[PDB]
């Protein structure tokens, strides 16, 4: 399982607020579409909470909420609501929104993904079904707060997390076939093997995607502002701060 | 600008078919959106093959071109069109539409961008415009043809290209401001420098992406077709004489 670091609680925290303000749209969602790829979103990502069927309870009650109530009176049912259903596990800790809430959530899935692909079996069906989802879950992120820039910049360049996703997928289906997967410690590793029947693949990859594509944004960020942009993120930095190994 | 070989001509001729057949969308559009979206595509289009006002013409000539004809009909018309407005060189050689021909097309396109980068003036706002028009158009390439779990899967990893034509943006917006890009030999020395007052980009980007994108889709459809199962950088390059 994941390193259980102060940076990972945030993590684990931010995902609980997203999760919650995810749900709270379902009240005033003004489509059938919006409205299934809501419940949807939510039920996976509660189901990478670290029971199903009290969070279709939690899910469903959350549908039936009363469009007139604000967020913070339907703050207080969905506590109870989860209190009654026993996800108090489910509860947000702190309920500032921000980005960091979006990127932790991001970071938080990412490695999970990397958890699943070293704790598989060779249940190997059931990581890549898994795998599935988490295309899914990072093709339809919500910005909740307002950005519309970066809700136009997040879904061009979205298909880069989505896909490494496809490579460790491609990676599982090779070690499906005969070909086992070796693991390597650099990015360059990797993508010099895919460039020949090998199938190696980067030791923790979606960590190292999140926290490059977190850097990519914020760099273009100044080229949107238009300024003359001090201290990067770095793998280095990044391992240490998770207690990767 | 781009080594003028056999691949390349290739590569010429289905980028003005993939140009032909989405004008030809234009007729039938079935929404002010997507008669919006073609129109510019297409004027995009032209504008990196090798006059804009009769690029204009060609494509108000499509927008009113009857939607009754059937398509070998549409051929005819836009074949005396471009005679007409001296557009002879948009006339495509072949009209056998397969996949090769987008593949080709983003191939093309990859090219266009490699090359402007090469051939700028530090008209660094000139090159820097024409890499929005090049994300405008890898983010809403048409199948045409059809094949739905195409558009699903593209519009899905679309992003990986796009990502690297940023790459660039970033690369030469930093060249603006003083520290001048380095070109690299390959994409390690690349990704590995960014991780850390450098400006490295790899020579021919976007000609490896383009290629390491089509591996990868063809890697994945052995996952969609259920079935157990490729072009390599070294291959690519002799074959393109980059
Ligand atoms: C999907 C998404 C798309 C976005 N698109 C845009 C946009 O297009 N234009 C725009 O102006 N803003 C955009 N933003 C917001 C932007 O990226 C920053 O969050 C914003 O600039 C706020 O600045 P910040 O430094 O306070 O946040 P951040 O720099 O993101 O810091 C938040 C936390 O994340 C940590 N962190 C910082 N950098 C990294 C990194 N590389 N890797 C891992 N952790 C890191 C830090 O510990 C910090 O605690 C986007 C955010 C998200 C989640
Ligand atoms: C954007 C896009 C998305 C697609 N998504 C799917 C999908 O999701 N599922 C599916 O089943 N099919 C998909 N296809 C079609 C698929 O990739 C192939 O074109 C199709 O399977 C036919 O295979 P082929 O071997 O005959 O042609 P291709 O393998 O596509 O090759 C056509 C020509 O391109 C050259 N070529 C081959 N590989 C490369 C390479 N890495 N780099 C450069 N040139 C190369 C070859 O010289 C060949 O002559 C997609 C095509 C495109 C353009």
């Known amino acids: 399982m994941i390193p ?16 919650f303000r995810l749900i709270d ?9 919006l409205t299934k790829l809501l419940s949807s979103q939510a039920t996976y990502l509660y189901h990478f909470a670290c029971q199903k069927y ?38 947000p800790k702190s309920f500032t929104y921000t980005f960091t809430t ?10 999970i993904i990397d958890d699943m692909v070293y704790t598989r079996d060779k249940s190997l069906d059931f990581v890549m079904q898994q795998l599935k989802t988490m295309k899914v879950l990072f093709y339809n992120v919500f910005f909740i707060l307002q950005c519309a820039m970066c809700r136009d910049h997040y879904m061009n360049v979205k298909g ?6 496809e490579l460790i ?11 086992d997967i070796t693991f390597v410690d650099s990015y360059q590793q990797e993508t010099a093997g895919a460039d020949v029947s090998n199938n190696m693949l980067m030791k923790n990859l979606m960590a190292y995607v999140s926290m490059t ?33």
């Open 4 to 19: 259980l670091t102060p940076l990972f609680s945030r993590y684990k925290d931010s995902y609980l607020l997203y999760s």
């Open 160 to 165: 880069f997390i989505i896909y490494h996703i």
């Open 102 to 111: 979006i990127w932790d959530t991001m970071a938080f899935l990412s490695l």
């Open 25 to 33: 749209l379902l009240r005033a969602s003004k489509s059938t579409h």
């Open 213 to 245: 594509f977190h850097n990519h944004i914020n760099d273009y960020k100044w080229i949107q502002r238009n300024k003359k942009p001090y201290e990067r993120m770095t793998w280095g930095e990044y391992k240490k701060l998770l207690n990767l190994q």
């Open 54 to 91: 009290e969070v279709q309870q939690l899910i469903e009650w959350a549908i039936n909420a009363s469009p007139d109530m604000d967020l913070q009176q339907f703050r207080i049912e969905f506590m109870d609501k989860t209190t009654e259903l026993n996800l108090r596990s489910c509860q």
């Open 169 to 179: 997928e491609i990676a599982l289906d090779k070690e499906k076939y005969g070909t």
